[PDB]
Amino acid sequence: DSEKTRTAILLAAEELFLEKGVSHTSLEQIARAAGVTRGAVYWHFQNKAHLFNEMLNQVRLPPEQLTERLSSDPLRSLYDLCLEAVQSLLTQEKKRRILTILMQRCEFTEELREAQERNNAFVQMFIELCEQLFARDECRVRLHPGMTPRIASRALHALILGLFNDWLRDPRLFDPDTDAEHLLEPMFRGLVRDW
Amino acid sequence: KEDSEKTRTAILLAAEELFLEKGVSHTSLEQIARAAGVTRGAVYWHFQNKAHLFNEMLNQVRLPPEQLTERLSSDPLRSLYDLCLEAVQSLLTQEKKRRILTILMQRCEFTEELREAQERNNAFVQMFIELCEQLFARDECRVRLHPGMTPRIASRALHALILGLFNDWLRDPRLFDPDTDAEHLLEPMFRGLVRDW
């Protein structure tokens, strides 16, 4: 009953944020566009930052799935995961739309403090997982001399983030389907001995 | 000549501080004028609109095309590495650069009202990418790429890494030290692209 109202609100906000930007989109405007009362929006989402965060959650992998996925070869699972993430830019319109909002249509003022904090936390976690993965004896032994797990996880994440950022800014740059393999290849070849 | 160039700088500094604190959307030209100790007409007079103002601000911090080319023209796969290394390291050594780029990647949303700024931003990136592509495409360099690494992919992989490092660090500066970690963050990309390295 209410879960249908929640989705309606988030879809409306998704469209508005995407067209107008987050700053220039109010909760009143979202309510109106969703065919709903202002009170109902405030009721379900409290404030704009929390709304924005719930929206992002529709598209983020929960911690339990990440861990389970990276637990034979973990260094190949990580590659696979990254490859699929890049490839998802094409195959998942919802993901594409929401991430273009995140990286292109919003500014992290005080009013979005909560959203930034939880965004940082999510990235921090992914980085910590990779760090831990690279830090295992089985994996660490395979890194090149002077590649530490700390640097490896950060180099990798930066690459993924950059690809997302570049492509969403300008989708002519590459094809997420057929170029993803080759865009990621050098990073993994540069980190790992055999590859 | 000079009289007005002083007024221009004052306006840009005011906007830099305001954009950084409030965000670009929530910063008006009226507010900039007031913070700069100047009339609203003078701002409009020097910069026309917010997007153009924002673009002039970024220009203070961008390498012109002629310097890029000159820098990448013995070993030039090395000059490119050096250039990237310095870019990452500049995050610490140049506060003005840091402030303005934090605005670009963190404190502004590319709506219609900033269409002009986005277009010229794209053009600048497009150019850097085209230069790298051309560099990797030279016989001297191309021969050194691994099997199935094309210049097109190489330039885009590299740029994405640089962009990502800037983005990550400016979002969370605890992640790494631009001074002492830059070498090691870039190392694998270059080792992965080039045979000998």
Short mmCIF file of C-alpha atoms in Angstrom, two decimals:
data_model
loop_
_atom_site.label_atom_id
_atom_site.label_comp_id
_atom_site.label_asym_id
_atom_site.label_seq_id
_atom_site.Cartn_x
_atom_site.Cartn_y
_atom_site.Cartn_z
CA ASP A 1 0.00 0.00 0.00
CA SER A 2 2.60 2.58 1.17
CA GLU A 3 5.56 0.88 -0.58
CA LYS A 4 3.77 1.82 -3.85
CA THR A 5 3.58 5.45 -2.65
CA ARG A 6 7.30 5.36 -1.76
CA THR A 7 8.30 4.14 -5.24
CA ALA A 8 6.06 6.76 -6.90
CA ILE A 9 7.77 9.53 -4.91
CA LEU A 10 11.28 8.22 -5.72
CA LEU A 11 10.48 7.95 -9.46
CA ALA A 12 9.16 11.53 -9.47
CA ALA A 13 12.26 12.79 -7.64
CA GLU A 14 14.52 10.81 -9.98
CA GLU A 15 12.96 12.53 -13.03
CA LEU A 16 13.00 16.00 -11.39
CA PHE A 17 16.56 15.79 -10.03
CA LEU A 18 17.70 14.58 -13.43
CA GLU A 19 16.03 17.50 -15.30
CA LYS A 20 16.29 20.40 -12.79
CA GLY A 21 19.15 19.39 -10.48
CA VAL A 22 18.81 18.57 -6.76
CA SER A 23 19.25 22.14 -5.40
CA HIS A 24 16.47 23.54 -7.62
CA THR A 25 14.14 20.59 -6.75
CA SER A 26 12.01 20.93 -3.60
CA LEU A 27 10.02 18.34 -1.66
CA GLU A 28 6.83 20.26 -2.53
CA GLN A 29 7.64 19.95 -6.27
CA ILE A 30 8.36 16.22 -5.87
CA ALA A 31 5.05 15.65 -4.05
CA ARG A 32 3.12 17.49 -6.79
CA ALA A 33 4.90 15.55 -9.58
CA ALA A 34 4.23 12.25 -7.76
CA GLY A 35 0.47 12.96 -7.41
CA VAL A 36 0.80 13.06 -3.64
CA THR A 37 0.55 15.40 -0.63
CA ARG A 38 3.60 17.30 0.69
CA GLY A 39 2.93 15.68 4.09
CA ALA A 40 3.27 12.16 2.63
CA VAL A 41 6.75 12.93 1.25
CA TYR A 42 7.89 14.37 4.60
CA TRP A 43 6.25 11.33 6.26
CA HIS A 44 8.10 8.70 4.18
CA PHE A 45 11.48 10.45 3.73
CA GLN A 46 11.79 13.19 6.45
CA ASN A 47 14.17 15.44 4.47
CA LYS A 48 15.71 15.87 1.02
CA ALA A 49 19.08 14.31 1.97
CA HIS A 50 17.45 11.16 3.32
CA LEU A 51 15.24 10.94 0.23
CA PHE A 52 18.32 11.24 -2.00
CA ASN A 53 20.02 8.52 0.05
CA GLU A 54 17.08 6.11 -0.19
CA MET A 55 17.15 6.73 -3.94
CA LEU A 56 20.84 5.81 -4.19
CA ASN A 57 20.19 2.64 -2.13
CA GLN A 58 17.92 1.31 -4.93
CA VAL A 59 21.10 1.06 -7.03
CA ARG A 60 23.88 0.18 -4.55
CA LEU A 61 25.00 -3.34 -3.59
CA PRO A 62 24.48 -4.17 0.09
CA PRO A 63 27.67 -5.03 2.14
CA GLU A 64 26.67 -8.70 2.56
CA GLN A 65 26.51 -9.32 -1.22
CA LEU A 66 29.86 -7.59 -1.88
CA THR A 67 31.64 -9.70 0.77
CA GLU A 68 29.98 -12.95 -0.32
CA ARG A 69 31.04 -12.26 -3.89
CA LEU A 70 34.69 -11.61 -3.06
CA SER A 71 35.09 -14.53 -0.59
CA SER A 72 38.01 -20.33 -6.30
CA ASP A 73 39.99 -17.16 -7.33
CA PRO A 74 39.06 -13.99 -5.43
CA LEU A 75 41.28 -11.80 -7.62
CA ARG A 76 39.20 -12.87 -10.65
CA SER A 77 35.86 -12.32 -8.79
CA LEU A 78 36.95 -8.74 -8.09
CA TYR A 79 37.75 -8.21 -11.79
CA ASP A 80 34.40 -9.76 -12.75
CA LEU A 81 32.59 -7.52 -10.27
CA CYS A 82 34.28 -4.38 -11.67
CA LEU A 83 33.62 -5.48 -15.24
CA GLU A 84 29.91 -5.97 -14.50
CA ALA A 85 29.70 -2.61 -12.72
CA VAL A 86 31.07 -0.81 -15.80
CA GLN A 87 28.86 -2.89 -18.13
CA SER A 88 25.77 -2.12 -15.99
CA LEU A 89 25.96 1.52 -17.21
CA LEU A 90 24.29 0.34 -20.43
CA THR A 91 22.14 -2.57 -19.28
CA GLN A 92 20.46 -0.74 -16.34
CA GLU A 93 18.74 2.57 -17.27
CA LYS A 94 17.65 3.19 -13.66
CA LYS A 95 21.27 2.89 -12.46
CA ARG A 96 22.45 5.16 -15.25
CA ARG A 97 19.83 7.83 -14.46
CA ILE A 98 20.48 7.83 -10.69
CA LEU A 99 24.28 7.85 -11.00
CA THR A 100 24.12 10.72 -13.48
CA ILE A 101 22.18 12.58 -10.78
CA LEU A 102 24.84 11.71 -8.19
CA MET A 103 27.85 12.75 -10.26
CA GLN A 104 26.34 15.42 -12.47
CA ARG A 105 23.11 16.95 -11.06
CA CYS A 106 23.81 17.63 -7.36
CA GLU A 107 26.02 19.78 -5.16
CA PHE A 108 27.02 18.69 -1.67
CA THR A 109 26.02 21.68 0.47
CA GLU A 110 25.04 21.44 4.17
CA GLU A 111 21.47 20.40 3.23
CA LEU A 112 22.91 17.18 1.68
CA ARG A 113 25.40 16.52 4.53
CA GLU A 114 23.73 13.20 5.44
CA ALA A 115 23.88 11.96 1.84
CA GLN A 116 27.59 12.77 1.49
CA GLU A 117 28.43 11.09 4.81
CA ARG A 118 26.72 7.83 3.79
CA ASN A 119 28.21 8.06 0.28
CA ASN A 120 31.69 8.32 1.80
CA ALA A 121 30.89 5.40 4.10
CA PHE A 122 29.84 3.19 1.15
CA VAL A 123 33.01 4.00 -0.81
CA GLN A 124 35.14 3.63 2.33
CA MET A 125 33.68 0.15 2.77
CA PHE A 126 34.29 -1.01 -0.80
CA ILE A 127 37.88 0.24 -0.48
CA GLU A 128 38.34 -1.56 2.86
CA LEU A 129 37.04 -4.82 1.36
CA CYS A 130 39.45 -4.63 -1.58
CA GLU A 131 42.30 -3.71 0.76
CA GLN A 132 41.50 -6.80 2.86
CA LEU A 133 41.28 -8.95 -0.31
CA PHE A 134 44.68 -7.76 -1.59
CA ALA A 135 46.06 -8.17 1.98
CA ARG A 136 45.40 -11.96 2.09
CA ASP A 137 48.55 -14.12 1.81
CA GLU A 138 47.13 -15.90 -1.27
CA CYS A 139 46.64 -12.54 -3.06
CA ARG A 140 49.36 -10.30 -1.55
CA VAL A 141 52.09 -12.69 -2.81
CA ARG A 142 50.81 -11.98 -6.36
CA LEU A 143 51.19 -8.17 -6.18
CA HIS A 144 54.24 -6.56 -7.83
CA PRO A 145 57.14 -5.37 -5.61
CA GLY A 146 56.09 -2.16 -3.80
CA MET A 147 52.37 -2.53 -4.53
CA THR A 148 50.67 -2.53 -1.14
CA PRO A 149 47.01 -3.48 -0.55
CA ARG A 150 46.30 0.10 0.58
CA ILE A 151 47.47 1.61 -2.73
CA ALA A 152 46.04 -1.20 -4.88
CA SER A 153 42.48 -0.80 -3.56
CA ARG A 154 42.65 2.99 -4.01
CA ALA A 155 44.16 2.86 -7.50
CA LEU A 156 41.47 0.37 -8.54
CA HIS A 157 38.56 2.30 -7.04
CA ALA A 158 39.75 5.56 -8.58
CA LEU A 159 39.79 3.88 -12.00
CA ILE A 160 36.23 2.55 -11.62
CA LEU A 161 34.99 5.89 -10.32
CA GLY A 162 36.73 7.74 -13.14
CA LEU A 163 35.26 5.50 -15.84
CA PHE A 164 31.77 6.07 -14.41
CA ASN A 165 32.39 9.81 -14.21
CA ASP A 166 33.86 10.13 -17.72
CA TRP A 167 31.21 8.00 -19.41
CA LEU A 168 28.25 9.63 -17.67
CA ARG A 169 29.65 13.06 -18.53
CA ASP A 170 30.31 12.02 -22.18
CA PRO A 171 28.93 8.62 -23.35
CA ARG A 172 30.68 8.95 -26.74
CA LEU A 173 34.03 8.24 -24.99
CA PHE A 174 33.65 4.48 -24.97
CA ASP A 175 31.27 1.53 -25.15
CA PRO A 176 30.70 0.04 -21.65
CA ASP A 177 29.77 -3.32 -23.20
CA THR A 178 32.73 -4.06 -25.49
CA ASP A 179 35.46 -1.70 -24.08
CA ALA A 180 35.10 -2.46 -20.32
CA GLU A 181 37.46 -5.48 -20.51
CA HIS A 182 40.21 -3.44 -22.17
CA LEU A 183 39.77 -0.36 -19.96
CA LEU A 184 40.23 -2.49 -16.81
CA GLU A 185 42.89 -4.84 -18.27
CA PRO A 186 45.95 -2.62 -17.72
CA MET A 187 45.08 -1.82 -14.09
CA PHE A 188 44.83 -5.51 -13.22
CA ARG A 189 47.87 -6.41 -15.33
CA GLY A 190 49.79 -3.64 -13.52
CA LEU A 191 48.77 -4.78 -10.02
CA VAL A 192 49.08 -8.58 -10.40
CA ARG A 193 52.09 -10.66 -11.45
CA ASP A 194 50.64 -13.32 -13.72
CA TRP A 195 47.31 -12.00 -15.09
CA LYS B 1 43.41 48.22 -18.80
CA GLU B 2 44.25 47.53 -15.10
CA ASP B 3 41.46 49.39 -13.20
CA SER B 4 38.90 46.75 -14.25
CA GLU B 5 41.19 43.66 -14.14
CA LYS B 6 41.37 44.31 -10.37
CA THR B 7 37.55 44.33 -10.21
CA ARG B 8 37.45 41.06 -12.22
CA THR B 9 39.82 39.27 -9.80
CA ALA B 10 37.87 40.56 -6.77
CA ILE B 11 34.64 39.15 -8.21
CA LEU B 12 36.24 35.74 -9.00
CA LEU B 13 37.75 35.44 -5.52
CA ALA B 14 34.36 36.26 -3.94
CA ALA B 15 32.60 33.70 -6.15
CA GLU B 16 35.31 31.09 -5.39
CA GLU B 17 34.70 31.48 -1.64
CA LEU B 18 30.87 31.51 -2.01
CA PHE B 19 30.65 28.56 -4.44
CA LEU B 20 32.96 26.62 -2.12
CA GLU B 21 30.83 27.29 0.98
CA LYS B 22 27.26 27.43 -0.41
CA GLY B 23 27.44 25.55 -3.71
CA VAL B 24 26.97 27.05 -7.19
CA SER B 25 23.15 26.61 -7.42
CA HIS B 26 22.54 28.40 -4.10
CA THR B 27 24.99 31.21 -5.07
CA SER B 28 23.56 34.09 -7.09
CA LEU B 29 25.29 36.85 -9.03
CA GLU B 30 23.71 39.37 -6.62
CA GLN B 31 25.30 37.58 -3.64
CA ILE B 32 28.69 37.48 -5.42
CA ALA B 33 28.52 41.21 -6.17
CA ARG B 34 27.71 42.02 -2.54
CA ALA B 35 30.51 39.78 -1.21
CA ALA B 36 32.96 41.36 -3.69
CA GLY B 37 32.08 44.93 -2.61
CA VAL B 38 30.68 45.70 -6.04
CA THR B 39 27.42 46.48 -7.90
CA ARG B 40 25.26 43.74 -9.45
CA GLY B 41 25.61 45.52 -12.78
CA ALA B 42 29.42 45.27 -12.70
CA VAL B 43 29.29 41.45 -12.32
CA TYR B 44 26.84 41.12 -15.22
CA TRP B 45 29.05 43.59 -17.09
CA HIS B 46 32.29 41.59 -16.73
CA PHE B 47 30.91 38.03 -16.84
CA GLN B 48 27.43 38.16 -18.51
CA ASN B 49 26.06 35.07 -16.77
CA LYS B 50 26.86 32.56 -14.03
CA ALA B 51 28.08 29.84 -16.45
CA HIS B 52 30.56 32.16 -18.12
CA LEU B 53 31.76 33.38 -14.71
CA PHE B 54 32.28 29.78 -13.60
CA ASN B 55 34.19 29.07 -16.82
CA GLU B 56 36.49 32.09 -16.42
CA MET B 57 37.18 30.84 -12.90
CA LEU B 58 38.20 27.41 -14.13
CA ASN B 59 40.46 28.95 -16.76
CA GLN B 60 42.62 30.38 -13.94
CA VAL B 61 43.58 26.74 -13.17
CA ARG B 62 43.66 24.94 -16.59
CA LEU B 63 46.78 24.25 -18.75
CA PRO B 64 46.48 25.89 -22.18
CA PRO B 65 46.59 23.53 -25.27
CA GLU B 66 49.98 24.89 -26.42
CA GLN B 67 51.74 23.92 -23.14
CA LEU B 68 50.23 20.42 -23.08
CA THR B 69 51.38 19.68 -26.65
CA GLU B 70 54.85 21.19 -26.12
CA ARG B 71 55.27 19.07 -22.98
CA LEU B 72 54.33 15.79 -24.74
CA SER B 73 56.32 16.38 -27.97
CA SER B 74 63.59 11.92 -25.52
CA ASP B 75 61.06 9.43 -24.16
CA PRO B 76 57.64 10.93 -24.27
CA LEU B 77 55.75 8.12 -22.65
CA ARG B 78 57.78 9.36 -19.74
CA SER B 79 56.78 13.03 -20.17
CA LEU B 80 53.14 11.90 -20.04
CA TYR B 81 53.78 9.99 -16.80
CA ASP B 82 55.62 13.03 -15.37
CA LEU B 83 52.74 15.31 -16.37
CA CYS B 84 50.16 13.04 -14.69
CA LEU B 85 52.33 12.69 -11.59
CA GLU B 86 52.63 16.49 -11.27
CA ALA B 87 48.89 16.97 -11.80
CA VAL B 88 48.13 14.60 -8.89
CA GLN B 89 50.86 16.19 -6.75
CA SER B 90 49.49 19.73 -7.51
CA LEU B 91 46.42 18.88 -5.35
CA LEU B 92 48.58 19.61 -2.29
CA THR B 93 50.99 22.26 -3.58
CA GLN B 94 48.35 24.59 -5.16
CA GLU B 95 45.53 25.70 -2.80
CA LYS B 96 43.78 27.78 -5.49
CA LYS B 97 43.66 24.71 -7.79
CA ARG B 98 42.41 22.53 -4.94
CA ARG B 99 39.66 25.03 -4.01
CA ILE B 100 38.40 25.53 -7.58
CA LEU B 101 38.49 21.80 -8.48
CA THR B 102 36.61 20.95 -5.26
CA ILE B 103 33.96 23.38 -6.55
CA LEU B 104 33.94 21.72 -9.99
CA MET B 105 33.59 18.15 -8.75
CA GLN B 106 31.80 18.64 -5.47
CA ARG B 107 29.94 21.94 -5.21
CA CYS B 108 28.09 22.26 -8.54
CA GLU B 109 25.36 20.56 -10.54
CA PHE B 110 25.26 20.74 -14.33
CA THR B 111 21.76 21.99 -15.01
CA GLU B 112 20.71 24.03 -18.09
CA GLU B 113 21.96 27.26 -16.43
CA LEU B 114 25.53 25.80 -16.50
CA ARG B 115 25.24 24.34 -20.05
CA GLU B 116 28.06 26.57 -21.37
CA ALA B 117 30.42 25.52 -18.57
CA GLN B 118 29.82 21.82 -19.17
CA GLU B 119 30.33 22.18 -22.95
CA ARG B 120 33.73 23.86 -22.49
CA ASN B 121 34.68 21.40 -19.74
CA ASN B 122 33.94 18.51 -22.13
CA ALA B 123 35.98 20.24 -24.84
CA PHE B 124 39.04 20.55 -22.56
CA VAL B 125 38.85 16.87 -21.53
CA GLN B 126 38.17 15.81 -25.12
CA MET B 127 41.37 17.59 -26.11
CA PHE B 128 43.58 16.03 -23.44
CA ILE B 129 42.22 12.61 -24.47
CA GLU B 130 42.87 13.31 -28.18
CA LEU B 131 46.46 14.35 -27.39
CA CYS B 132 47.15 11.16 -25.43
CA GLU B 133 45.49 9.08 -28.15
CA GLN B 134 47.79 10.70 -30.73
CA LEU B 135 50.82 10.13 -28.47
CA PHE B 136 50.02 6.42 -28.00
CA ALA B 137 49.27 6.21 -31.76
CA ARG B 138 52.84 7.17 -32.80
CA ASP B 139 54.91 4.26 -34.18
CA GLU B 140 57.59 4.82 -31.50
CA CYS B 141 54.98 4.49 -28.72
CA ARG B 142 52.32 2.18 -30.24
CA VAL B 143 54.92 -0.61 -30.68
CA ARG B 144 55.39 -0.52 -26.87
CA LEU B 145 51.72 -1.12 -25.98
CA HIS B 146 50.63 -4.63 -24.95
CA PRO B 147 48.74 -6.82 -27.50
CA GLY B 148 45.16 -5.52 -27.82
CA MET B 149 45.81 -2.18 -26.12
CA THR B 150 44.78 0.45 -28.65
CA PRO B 151 45.58 4.18 -28.34
CA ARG B 152 41.85 4.93 -28.06
CA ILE B 153 41.43 2.70 -24.97
CA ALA B 154 44.80 3.63 -23.45
CA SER B 155 44.07 7.38 -23.42
CA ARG B 156 40.62 6.80 -21.92
CA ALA B 157 41.80 4.32 -19.28
CA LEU B 158 44.54 6.76 -18.27
CA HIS B 159 42.30 9.82 -18.14
CA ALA B 160 39.66 7.97 -16.14
CA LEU B 161 42.32 7.03 -13.56
CA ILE B 162 43.56 10.65 -13.22
CA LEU B 163 39.99 11.96 -13.00
CA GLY B 164 39.09 9.32 -10.43
CA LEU B 165 42.09 10.10 -8.23
CA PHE B 166 41.17 13.81 -8.26
CA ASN B 167 37.55 12.95 -7.51
CA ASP B 168 38.32 10.47 -4.70
CA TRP B 169 40.91 12.67 -3.01
CA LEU B 170 38.87 15.88 -3.17
CA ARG B 171 35.83 13.96 -1.80
CA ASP B 172 37.96 12.36 0.99
CA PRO B 173 41.58 13.63 1.43
CA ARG B 174 42.30 10.93 4.05
CA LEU B 175 42.38 8.30 1.25
CA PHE B 176 45.94 9.01 0.21
CA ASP B 177 48.83 11.45 0.18
CA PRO B 178 49.15 13.15 -3.25
CA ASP B 179 52.84 13.85 -2.58
CA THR B 180 54.21 10.39 -1.66
CA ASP B 181 51.48 8.04 -3.04
CA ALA B 182 51.03 9.54 -6.54
CA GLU B 183 53.92 7.48 -8.01
CA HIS B 184 52.45 4.20 -6.75
CA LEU B 185 48.84 5.04 -7.67
CA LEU B 186 49.87 5.69 -11.29
CA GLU B 187 52.50 2.92 -11.51
CA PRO B 188 50.16 -0.02 -12.28
CA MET B 189 48.28 1.83 -15.04
CA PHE B 190 51.52 2.62 -16.86
CA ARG B 191 52.97 -0.83 -16.20
CA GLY B 192 49.72 -2.32 -17.56
CA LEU B 193 49.74 -0.22 -20.74
CA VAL B 194 53.45 -0.34 -21.65
CA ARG B 195 55.68 -3.41 -22.24
CA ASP B 196 58.96 -2.45 -20.57
CA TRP B 197 58.20 0.20 -17.91
#
